[PDB]
Amino acid sequence: AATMKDVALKAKVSTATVSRALMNPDKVSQATRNRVEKAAREVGYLP
């Protein structure tokens, strides 16, 4: 099973972004935001 964290590496988003995402999303770029949302479902884990 994959993890939302692993995805960040693939999209080179940021360890802080996905980390704070569950706390207060405000560091993810609009473009990277849409890509993550889609990539989040693929792994089955959206949180």
Q: What is the DSSP string of the chain?
A: ---HHHHHHHTT--HHHHHHHTT---SS-HHHHHHHHHHHHHTS---
Q: What token pair was written down for 30? A: 């609009």
CATH tag, 1-47: 1.10.260.40
Nearest to 28 by CA among 13, 11, 45: 13
- In angstroms, the CA 30 to CA 44 distance is 21
Q: What is the identity of the amino acid at 16?
A: A
Q: Contact at 8 Å (CB) between 27 and 14? A: yes
- In angstroms, the CA 39 to CA 7 distance is 7
**Experimental technique used to determine this entry:** NMR
- In angstroms, the CA 1 to CA 21 distance is 20
Nearest to 21 by CA among 2, 1, 39, 42: 39
* CA distances in angstroms from 13 to 6, 18, 30, 31, 39, listed in the order given: 10, 8, 12, 11, 12
Q: Contact at 8 Å (CB) between 25 and 1? A: no
